[PDB]
Write a protein that binds this ligand. Sequence first.
Ligand code: ZN
Lengths: 187, 186, 620, 72
Amino acid sequence: FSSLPSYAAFATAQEAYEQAVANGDSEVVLKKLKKSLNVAKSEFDRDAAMQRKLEKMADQAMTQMYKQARSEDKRAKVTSAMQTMLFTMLRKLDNDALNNIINNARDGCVPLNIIPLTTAAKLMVVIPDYNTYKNTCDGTTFTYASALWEIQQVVDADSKIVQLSEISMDNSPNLAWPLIVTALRAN
Amino acid sequence: FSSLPSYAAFATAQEAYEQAVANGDSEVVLKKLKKSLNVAKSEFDRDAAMQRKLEKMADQAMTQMYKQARSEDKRAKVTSAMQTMLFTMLRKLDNDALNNIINNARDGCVPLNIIPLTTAAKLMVVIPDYNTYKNTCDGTTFTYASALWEIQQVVDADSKIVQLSEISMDNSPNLAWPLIVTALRA
Amino acid sequence: NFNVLFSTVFPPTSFGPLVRKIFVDGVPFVVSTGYHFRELGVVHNQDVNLHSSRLSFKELLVYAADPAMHAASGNLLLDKRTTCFSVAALTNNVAFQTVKPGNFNKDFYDFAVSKGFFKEGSSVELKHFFFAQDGNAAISDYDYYRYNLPTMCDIRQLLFVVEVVDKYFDCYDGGCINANQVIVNNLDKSAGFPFNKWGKARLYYDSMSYEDQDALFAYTKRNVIPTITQMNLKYAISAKNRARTVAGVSICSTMTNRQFHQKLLKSIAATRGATVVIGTSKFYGGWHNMLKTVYSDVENPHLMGWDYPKCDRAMPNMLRIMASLVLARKHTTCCSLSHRFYRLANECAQVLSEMVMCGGSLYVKPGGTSSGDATTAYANSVFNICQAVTANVNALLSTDGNKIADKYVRNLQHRLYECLYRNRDVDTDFVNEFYAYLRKHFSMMILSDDAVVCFNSTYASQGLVASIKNFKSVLYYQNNVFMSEAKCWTETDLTKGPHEFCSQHTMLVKQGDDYVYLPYPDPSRILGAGCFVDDIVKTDGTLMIERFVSLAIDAYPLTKHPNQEYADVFHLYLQYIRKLHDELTGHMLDMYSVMLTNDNTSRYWEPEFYEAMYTPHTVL
Amino acid sequence: KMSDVKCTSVVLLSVLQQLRVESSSKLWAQCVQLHNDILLAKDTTEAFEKMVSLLSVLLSMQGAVDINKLCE
RNA sequence: GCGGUAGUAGCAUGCUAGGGAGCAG
RNA sequence: AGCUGCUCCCUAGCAUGCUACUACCG
Ligand SMILES: [Zn+2]
C-alpha cells in the first residue's frame, strides 16, 4: 500500500511534528507528537500489514480456480478418447455369425470363451520348434476347432517373412524359431 | 554481513554507549542510549538476516541448475564413454588369448561368426593380404586365439575354391585377396 | 469344497464371464452380465438395462475395463509354447520383451580396490548382479502356473482351523469408509490395461468426484465386474538368473478394494506387540522389542524357520477364499449378507481367475495369488497362520494317546477329536482353550509368508506340538509341493537370534549399559548395490551422495562383527562419502568461485549420526 | 582377477546392447547366455573362454573403429 | 515498577503438502 | 509399468509454543 488514507495522515502528522521539533517549543510538544506518530503508525500497521492477507487469499483462490479448470478439461478429453475407442472396436463384431449363435441361446447368454472360437475370421498360431510345426500347421490347409483354415504369410521372431519351402528338417537350424502362422477361415 | 549501511549506525550508538559506560553519567542520557540502540539493533537485525538467507538461496539454486546441466550432458555421451571404458578395462586385463584376437582385428584379420569352444564346430576367418597369411598360416595349421586349428578350405572374394599350394608371394596378385579360411579346432 | 471336485468333469470353455447383447443409442454392444465360477457356481447381475440412451462417465469406465469387447473383436489364438488356456490375440503381431544389463560404477570399484578389497581368498566377494533376459522370458515365466492344481480339502478340519485363525485376528477393527477418507500414496503409477493408454492413476482420481466413486462402490455390491491384469518384467538386482514378473491390476479394481479393506489394513499396520508384525520398524530398538516379544515365556525354547516353494503359484483356491472371508468378517454392521457375497465374487473374478494380458494376447489364469492387488501381504499372513495351525492339529491327533503321560494333554486330544468329527457347530470354550495352549507352547512372529517360531522342545520331541516334518507332510498333501529340509533351519541357543528373518542376521552386542539385539545384512548385497546401477542414478557420485548415506545407514551394524573384513564396508562407505563431498566442493570453487558458507555436513562422515539410528530413543 | 573379468563382461554386454544387436533374436540369445554364464562362474579359466567367445561378436561387426579406440 | 493488548526480530516441537533417494515382503 | 511397510535429505505453508525488542493502557 502506498496511496491509502492512513498514509497521508501519518506523513503530514510526522512532517508537522518534526517541523515543530525544529522549532523546539515545549516538553509536552515532544510527547504529543510522539503519541500522534505512535497512533498514526498504529493506523499504518493495520492498513498496511493486515491489508495484505486479502491479496494472498485472493491469489490462493485464483490458483485453485486455474487448477479446477485444467482438471475439468482433462476429464472431457479422456471421455472422448474412451468412447471413440469403444465405437471403433464395435464396428468389427456386428457380423451375422454372432447373431446366429446369440439367437441359438435359450436366454441370450453365452460363454465368452466360445465367441472367438466360432466367429473369428483369422487365426494365429505360435510354434516353438519343427516337430510341433509338423504336427499342427502342415501343408497349405489344416483343420482346427471343427473348422478348416488356409495359410497366408509366415513370419519369425524378427518379423521377417518366411516361405513355406524353407521350413524343412535340414534348414531348421537357420531360422529364428518362434514361428507365427496366419490363416483364414475357409467356407 | 558488515558491509551493510545500518552497521555504521549500530556501531555509532554503540560507541556512544561505550563512552557512557566509561563516563559514569546521569540517568536520562542513558535512557537516550537505551532508546536509540534498540532502534538500531532492530533496523539492522532485519536487513542482515534476510540477505544472509538470500546468499544461501542463490547458492542452492546455482547448485540445482549445475546438477541439471551435468546430468543432461552425461547421458548424451554414453556411446563413446562406454567404448573407451571397455577398451581401457580390456587393456588392463592383460590376457594372451584376448590380445591375440584384438591385435589381429586391428591389422585386419577378423572372424565371420562366433568363435567356437568345442573341439568340433567350424571357424571362418578373413585374411586381407599375404603378410598376415605368412605369419599366421603354416602348412595346414592355423594359430588363432591362442589355439591351434586345421585348415579345410580356402576361397577368394568371388566364392571360388582355391587350393592351398598355389598361395604364395608371386601368385598373390592373381587372386581376390580377401581370402576366407575355413578351419576346425584341434 | 464340493464344487471344486465336481467342476473337473465339465468342459473348460464353459467357465468365465457370460455375455449378452444390449442396445445403447440404437447400436448393439456385447457386455458381461454374469459369471460362471469353478467354486461358486452361476452368478447373475442384478442391474442390467437394455435400451440405454447414452453412457455416463462411470458406465464408460465399466464398459472399457470389460474383457468382453476386447476378446470379441480380436483374432483367434493357438499358442503352443504354454499349456494354459488362450483366448484371443489383440493385434496382428506378437511382442517379445527383453531385460537389459546393469551399469558399472567404475569409480567406486577403483576406490574399493585401492583400499584392499576383492583380494584372492577374501571372504567378501560380489554375488549380486543384474541378469539379462532374452525375448522368450515373459511367456516362459507365465508358464509356471502349471503348478496350480485342483485341491479338495478336509472340510471338518478346515472349519475348526478357520475359527482358531480368526481368533488370531481379534484385536483389530474394520468396516467400510467413504471416498473422502481414502489415502492414496504415489498417485503417479500405472493404471492397468485400457487405462494406461490415456494417463496414470492421478487422471482417474482427478476426473471422478467423491460421488462417482461412491456410486461405483455401491454398484460393486450388486454386480460383478471382471477385469484384465497385465504382466510386467522386473529390472532389479538379484543373486539368481531367474526372471521376475509383477502383476498390474486395473484401476477399477483397486479403487473399490481400497474402500473395502483399508480401515482394517491400517488398523493392523499400527499395532505393536501382536503376532503379525507388519508396520513395525527395526530402528530405534524395534528389532530387540520384536525378538523379546516372540521369545515370550516358552519353557524349553528352540527357534525354527521353514520355507514355501513356489508360494504364489501353488496356493490352492480354497485357502485364498478362506483368507478373503477371514478378512471380510469385520463387516458385520455395515454390509448385509448379499453385499458380502457379491464382494467376494468380485474379488474372485478380479484377482483369482481373471484374464491376463501377456505380450499382446489374453490368457486364462488357473488360480493362485496375483502379487499386485491391494491385499497381498495380509492374505499371505492369514495363509501362513492357517498352515501352522493345521500342522499343530495334525501333530497332536496322530499321536498314540495311551503313551501321553500328562492327563491335561490327553483330555485336550480327546476333546479335539470330538470337536472336529463329532460336533457340527462352533464350540467357543474349546477354541479359547486351544488358542491359549498354542500361544503358550508355540509362539510365532509372522510377516507376509515369512515366519519365526519359538517352541517347547520337550513337547515337540513327544509329538505334542508341530515339528519340522509335520510341515512337510501338510505341504505335501495340502499344497502339492515338496519342502526340502535344506531351506529350513533350527536354533538351540537363544543368545543368538534367528538364523534368518527378512534377509537379516541377528547379533547380540553391548550398547551402553546393557546387551541388545541388532540386525545386519549380507555384505555382498551392500557392495553390489554400490557397484551396479541404472545410469545417472550413479556413475557420478557427486550428483546424488544421499544414496551412499542410506547404504551406510543400512550397513552400520557390521562394525560390531568379529570378522574384520566386515567393518571395512562401513569404513569404506564413510571414506567415499568424504571424498565425494570434497570433489563437489572443489569443482564448485574451481568453476564459479563459490563456497558453501556453513557445511553442517561433516556429520555424514562421522559415525555418531549412524550410531544414533539403532538406540532406543525415537527421533524420526 | 575374477572381479575384473565379471565387470568387463557387464560393460561388454552394455556396448553390444547399444549397438542394436537385440534386433537379431539368435545373436542376442547367445550373448545373453554367455553373459549370464560368466557371472556365475567359480574358476577363472572358463570365464576367459566365454569372454573370447563373447568378444568375437563385437569383433565381427563393423560399428567400432578399432584403430582409433586403441590409441594406447 | 508491574500486568494486559497491539507490533517487529530470532529460536524450538509437532502437522499438512511437494520433490529426490534407499531397504524389505 | 504393481500392492504395502520403514527410513534419509531438501523446500514451502499454517497452527501452536518459547524467547527477545518497540508502542498503547491500566
Ligand atoms: Zn462393509
